[PDB]
């Protein structure tokens, strides 16, 4: 488990060093965007979080593409990562499923949280939002999912 080094934490697997710097560059930036840089506007503070969410998402996409896509590491490296909280087991378990392949997060597919219905507009393909932009003619009001800043999360866009 623990992100902290501690004695219980089973020492690294092998290929680790080859990736180690790519990891650390994300890591510093988290320490960077958690820094409490004040703003009076709600719109901002939520933006601030939109970083942390984004980074976390990239790190996981990276480890994921290494292990599954190109198979450039070994099962024990990978599983050691995931044990150390380097990447989301779960989220990656979505990226393996058919449609979700490019998914945001796991709030953005929650059915139960949203007032009605489901699934932030975050998911719908642009190919349709554009259709209501056709008929109605207002272009398209959507830009950022309040939770993330997804824009066309669905795996076509």
């Amino acid at each position: 488990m623990p992100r902290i080094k501690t004695r219980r934490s089973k020492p690294a697997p092998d290929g680790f060093e080859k990736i180690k710097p790519t990891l650390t560059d994300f890591e510093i930036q988290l320490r960077d965007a958690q820094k409490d840089k004040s703003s009076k506007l709600a719109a901002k503070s939520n933006e601030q979080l939109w970083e942390i969410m984004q980074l976390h998402h990239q790190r996981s996409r990276y480890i994921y593409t290494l292990y599954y896509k190109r198979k450039a590491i070994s099962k024990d490296l990978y599983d050691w990562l995931i044990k150390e909280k380097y990447a989301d087991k779960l989220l990656i378990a979505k990226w393996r499923k058919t449609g979700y392949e490019k998914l945001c997060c796991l709030r953005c597919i929650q059915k139960n949280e949203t007032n009605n219905g489901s699934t932030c507009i975050c998911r719908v393909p642009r190919a349709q939002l554009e259709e209501e932009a056709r008929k109605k003619g207002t272009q398209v009001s959507f830009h950022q999912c309040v939770h993330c800043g997804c824009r066309g999360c669905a795996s076509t866009d």
Binding site: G149, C150, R151, D157
Partner: peptide, 23 residues
């Protein structure tokens, strides 16, 4: 729509996936 149309069409968004901004 068509697959070619989509594939070509997307690169337009500024920053890869999915945070990348159309327009």
């Amino acid at each position: 729509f068509t697959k070619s149309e989509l594939k070509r069409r997307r690169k337009t968004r500024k920053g890869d996936g999915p945070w990348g901004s159309w327009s």
